[PDB]
Ligand binder design. Structure first.
Ligand SMILES: [Ca+2]
Ligand SMILES: [Ca+2]
Lengths: 146, 146
């Protein structure tokens, strides 16, 4: 009962191998280190809400989420969506510096796993679109379980 | 170490509120009762592999999966995909009768939660396409956590 708080860190990261939906939305559960990733065609507020809808189904509802001040995260729409769910939102400190370091380490382990699985399949450039889906699933698998 | 075996039961179920991608692929982890659902436009073998790719990222790799003899599940393609992952597959007994009862109970709790959340939003018929995604996320959330 003295366990970790259910706080998430989310961010978006660009990955051209995953084009056209090359914007990967990544969420790290700081309680368990689990990771949830979704792809999007454009960074929008709505992209951020859809990514969270999916992470919540997978991780359960957090008590809070930390993001940077990107505008897709502090727009009105996003504040209202998070309010409707009852989740608190913080963008940390104005000149944070650090503080979002797990989601950033996550971003880097993820892109690396994607490159190594993609190349294992013989794709050295963009991944065929029909194949990105299982590859992105496979990457997430590899970083969360086995 | 005497805990339950990681065996899944998967099935596809039709849901017109979710049209055009009205075929919902549902997987129950018989170890934890967690549920994973994905939508598809057509019931194909490939639909079954994509659904599992996503469930594995979410639940980890099972030791076995039980399905009925639908052809999308015993086709060559599907047998080879499951073989590549190292998961055993069984379709149970020829005139099983029961044995897939959790995935079927799941199918029914799911469609019911979708109807009640959809109607809470004022959609009494098909759900606008742009809205199905979070609604399907929301349903899964409700049946797995809170
Ligand atoms: Ca950012
Ligand atoms: Ca069936």
């Amino acid at each position: 009962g003295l366990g970790p708080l259910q706080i998430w860190q989310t961010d978006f990261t660009l990955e051209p191998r995953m084009a056209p939906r090359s914007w990967l939305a990544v969420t790290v559960d700081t309680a368990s280190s689990a990771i949830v990733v979704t792809q999007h065609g454009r960074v929008t507020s709505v992209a951020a809400q859809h990514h969270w809808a999916t992470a919540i189904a997978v991780l359960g509802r957090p008590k809070a989420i930390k993001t940077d001040n990107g505008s897709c995260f502090t727009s009105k729409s996003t504040r209202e969506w998070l309010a409707r769910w009852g989740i608190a939102h913080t963008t940390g400190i104005p000149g944070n510096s650090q503080g979002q370091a797990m989601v950033e380490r996550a971003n880097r382990l993820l892109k690396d796993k994607i490159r190594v699985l993609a190349e294992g399949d013989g794709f050295m450039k963009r991944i065929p679109t029909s194949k990105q889906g299982e590859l992105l699933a496979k990457a997430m698998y590899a970083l969360n379980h086995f």
